[PDB]
């Protein structure tokens with residue numbers, strides 16, 4: 001079975017930035033990939049639609065997915081509030097890596113990040129589970145509205161998301 005492709009359509013201050021297309025590596029991390037896929041489609045009754053990129057740091061990563069507290073302290077997975085680190089097989093190889101945000105070991109929920117640089121120091125600490133395959137330019141636009149603290153200069157909103165099937 002082919003790896004799922006999913007999308008995020010992103011606004012800045014109500015103005016469309018475009019579409020990010022992500023391949024989820026369900027072959028290597030099936031459980032982590034399925035959580036993200038299901039949060040994109042909303043099929044458990046909750047997910048990413050309408051939530052924000054709440055922490056964006058230039059030359060590091062763009063972080064999103066806290067649809068419960070919208071500030072980096074929340075989120076939940078389709079398995080429960082948190083689920084374990086599935087494996088650390090895939091590595092933070094460069095820009096475009098899609099990886100799980102966490103608050104330490106075995107705290108995956110819904111928050112995720114897209115790298116804008118090789119973040120190798122996160123290897124073995126954050127579960128990588130996909131990669132940008134179209135729309136890296138959009139990711140760079142998101143990055144342009146970040147700051148050193150991560151606070152965004154514009155409201156960055158995932159206005160739609162889903163699975164490309």
Ligand SMILES: Cc1cccc(C[C@@H]2NC(=O)[C@]3(Cc4ccccc4)CCCN(C3)C(=O)/C=C/C(=O)NCC[C@@H](C(=O)NCCOCCN)NC(=O)Cc3ccccc3CNC2=O)c1
Pocket residue numbers: 055057058059060061063071072073074075100101102103107108109110111112113122126150
């Ligand atoms: C409950 C839950 C479940 C799943 C995910 C999450 C998100 C998770 N919430 C948090 O921890 C906190 C703490 C808290 C409070 C209440 C409940 C739970 C936790 C709240 C949000 C703000 N909060 C801390 C940070 O912001 C932390 C930054 C950090 O960990 N600082 C170290 C160096 C940096 C790097 O390497 N910086 C390089 C800078 O180079 C700039 C170049 N120009 N590492 C990082 O950011 C590591 C990293 C990596 C990817 C994604 C996220 C994160 C951080 N995890 C968070 O945000 C929370």
